């Protein structure tokens, strides 16, 4: 699980741009305030290679 890919972002990356922000992505109207839950998703998702 050391390899993580970003799954949610506001806008597509510009060419050759690194964004390593792990702030919770707000997918709904209600603010998340740094707490993941309903309409609040952690942007990074692991692969889990076996």
């Amino acid at each position: 699980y050391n390899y993580l890919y970003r799954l949610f972002r506001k806008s597509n990356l510009k060419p050759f741009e690194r964004d390593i922000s792990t702030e919770i992505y707000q997918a709904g109207s209600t603010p998340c305030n740094g707490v993941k839950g309903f309409n609040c998703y952690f942007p990074l998702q692991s692969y889990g290679f076996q």
Partner: antibody
Framework: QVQLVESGAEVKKPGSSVKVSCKASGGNFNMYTISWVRQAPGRGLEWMGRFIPIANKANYAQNFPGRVTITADKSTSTVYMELRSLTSDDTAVYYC???????????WGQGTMVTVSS | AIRMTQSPSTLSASVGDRVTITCRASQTINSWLAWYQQKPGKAPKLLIYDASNLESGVPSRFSGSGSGTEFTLTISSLQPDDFATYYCQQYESYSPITFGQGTRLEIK
């Protein structure tokens, strides 16, 4: 400076169950995995299981089929490891280790002494 | 399940000498191997990761080498503070992780 604090010493009887805690303080809890390592007196370290916060999954050692069930509360960044069917050979210090950055147990908890006897 | 074997299990040496510890695996675990140090009454601390790197804060006298199936931990200048039990991890398969049998270093 990430610091891991566990629960107090636990004294149980054979055939019962125990559940220790590991409070993760500092850093990001959603990326580093917490592994439980036990060490019986006079014996080397032994690995029990891993909790994977990023995938929200829990893994257990092959030598412990169904004996270990690991859960955690991501809101409070506290990891709970449950061991079932305690016996006289389960008297060991149950450390919790953070396999951070390079998959190695860089940060170790203080360790709780779990004693199983009559 | 990958089995880890250490050699020697018990070793004795004096201060300032050279100490070699061999921890041999059963399967090819590439270079995924960590060396620890557990003083009695204390939680083990990481010394070597990836079988060759040095953990931050560890004295430079600790050096690790080897890859594949046989690994080696070597101390250039042994110190009185460096007498403890050293274990080797095999973080190449997470089901289950197998530590070493324990290499206790004693004052000669």
């Amino acid at each position: 400076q990430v610091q891991l604090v566990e629960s107090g010493a636990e004294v149980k009887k054979p055939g019962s169950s125990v559940k220790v805690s590991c409070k993760a303080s500092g850093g990001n809890f959603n990326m580093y995995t917490i592994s439980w390592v036990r060490q019986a007196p006079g014996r080397g370290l032994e690995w029990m299981g891993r909790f994977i916060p990023i995938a929200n999954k829990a893994n257990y050692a092959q030598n412990f089929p169904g004996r270990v069930t690991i859960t955690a509360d991501k809101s409070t960044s506290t990891v709970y490891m449950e061991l079932r069917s305690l016996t006289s050979d389960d008297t060991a210090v149950y450390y919790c280790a953070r396999s951070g950055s390079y998959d190695a147990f860089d940060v170790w908890g203080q360790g709780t002494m779990v004693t199983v006897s009559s | 399940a990958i089995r880890m074997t250490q050699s020697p299990s018990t070793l004795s040496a004096s201060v300032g000498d050279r100490v070699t510890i061999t921890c041999r695996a059963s399967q090819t675990i590439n270079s995924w191997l960590a060396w620890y140090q557990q003083k009695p009454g204390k939680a083990p601390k990481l010394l070597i990761y990836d079988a060759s790197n040095l953990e931050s804060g560890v004295p430079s006298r600790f050096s690790g080498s080897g890859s594949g199936t046989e690994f080696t931990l070597t101390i250039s200048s042994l110190q009185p503070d460096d007498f403890a039990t050293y274990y080797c991890q095999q973080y190449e398969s997470y089901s289950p992780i197998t530590f070493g049998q324990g290499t206790r270093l004693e004052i000669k």
